[PDB]
Design a protein around this ligand. Structure first.
Ligand SMILES: Nc1ncnc2c1ncn2[C@@H]1O[C@H](COP(=O)(O)OP(=O)(O)O)[C@@H](O)[C@H]1O
Ligand SMILES: [Mg+2]
Length: 338
């Protein structure tokens, strides 16, 4: 079991969970039967490549470790150089333009490329959120998590839909690292934070311009509360109400739903699977952007259940699982230990 709030086990389980989500989810980038069939093939060697989700998470974490702090110039450069070195990881069509501009040594304003995206409105993709878990490992306070989730996200994702998705994901990880909670209290804390954020005029403006409801993440969290109280919620219901898409708004709430729903056993998923495995399986069964939804659900679940629920056979199937683990331990030593 995962032990105290912000334990080493929780740190390790968080990054391993994210890696598992990316690697296993990537196979389907779908039905529950087919997923269950496919995961049997993990049972008894870095055979599953990671994608942009992990590549960016690793750069983000390496920046934090390098500076023992957030440094936007260092982080932007690490993202750009990681892309330069290994461009075929499955980066979004939009965000590669950001990396190209950052690679220009004349670029001394590292937030400006992201702001120019999509006719100056910014990306609303889930790429800011997919990599953000490291932020919550580095920072314990809600205040710092919000601040640095936003800043890290804004390096590529300047739309409030994009960066607020990243904050929500980081807040979910923040909470999961604290250990045992009712699903009620977990969801309620998230709702409260997003209601606070969606009172800001930039959030209200971005939402209105995109033709959405007035406080979008808040509305989705309320929907999650309803779904968690509803009988026999089907994949159709989840996907139609929450989404399974590349947009942050259609993937971050979904990931959180998968975590909360899978806190309890489910007779549709064999009992031999543990809670972390169940969460990953369920999230992939939703289809769509299985890679990023599973990566995000995995980060939350990993933080909550800890490393003892990370199956060696799954973990050792993933490219770079040892590097991922070292980074988690390093985050714990530098920012959690003294
Ligand atoms: N403001 C936007 N207008 C139109 N499409 C967008 C917008 N923001 C994101 N997208 C879509 O989402 C995709 C992924 O976003 P992008 O920022 O490239 O990468 P990431 O997957 O890292 O979020 C884009 O290639 C595009 O298809
Ligand atoms: Mg990916």
């Amino acid at each position: 079991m995962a032990g105290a709030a912000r334990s080493l086990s929780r740190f390790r389980g968080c990054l391993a969970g994210a890696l598992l989500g990316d690697c296993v989810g990537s196979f389907y980038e779908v039905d529950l039967t087919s997923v269950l069939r496919h995961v049997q093939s993990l049972e008894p060697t870095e055979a599953l490549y990671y994608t942009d989700d992990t590549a960016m998470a690793r750069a983000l974490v390496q920046s934090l470790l390098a500076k023992e702090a957030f440094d936007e110039v260092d982080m932007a450069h690490r993202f750009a150089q990681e892309y330069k070195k290994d461009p075929d990881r499955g980066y979004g069509a939009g965000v590669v333009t950001v990396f190209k501009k950052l690679l220009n040594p004349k670029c001394r304003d590292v937030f400006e490329p992201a702001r120019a995206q999509f006719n100056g409105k910014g990306s609303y993709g889930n790429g800011g959120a997919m990599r953000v878990a490291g932020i919550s490992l580095a920072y314990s306070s809600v205040q710092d998590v919000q601040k640095f989730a936003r800043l890290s996200a804004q390096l590529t994702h300047a739309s409030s839909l994009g960066y607020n998705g990243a904050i929500l994901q980081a807040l979910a990880v923040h909470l999961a690292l604290q250990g045992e909670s009712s699903s009620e209290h977990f969801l309620k804390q998230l709702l409260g934070h997003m209601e606070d954020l969606e009172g800001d005029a930039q959030s209200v403006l971005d939402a209105r311009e995109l033709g959405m409801e007035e406080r979008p993440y808040s509305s989705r969290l309320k929907k999650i509360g309803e779904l968690l109280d509803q009988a026999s919620v089907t994949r159709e219901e989840v996907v139609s109400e929450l989404g399974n898409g590349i947009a942050a708004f259609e993937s971050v709430p979904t990931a959180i739903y998968c975590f909360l729903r899978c806190m309890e056993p489910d007779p549709e998923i064999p009992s031999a699977f543990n809670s972390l495995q169940r969460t990953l399986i369920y999230s992939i069964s939703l289809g769509g952007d299985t890679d990023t939804i599973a990566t995000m659900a995995g980060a939350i679940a990993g933080a909550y259940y800890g490393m003892d629920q990370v199956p060696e056979s799954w973990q050792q199937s993933c490219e770079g699982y040892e590097e991922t683990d070292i980074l988690a331990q390093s985050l714990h030593r530098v920012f959690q230990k003294s």
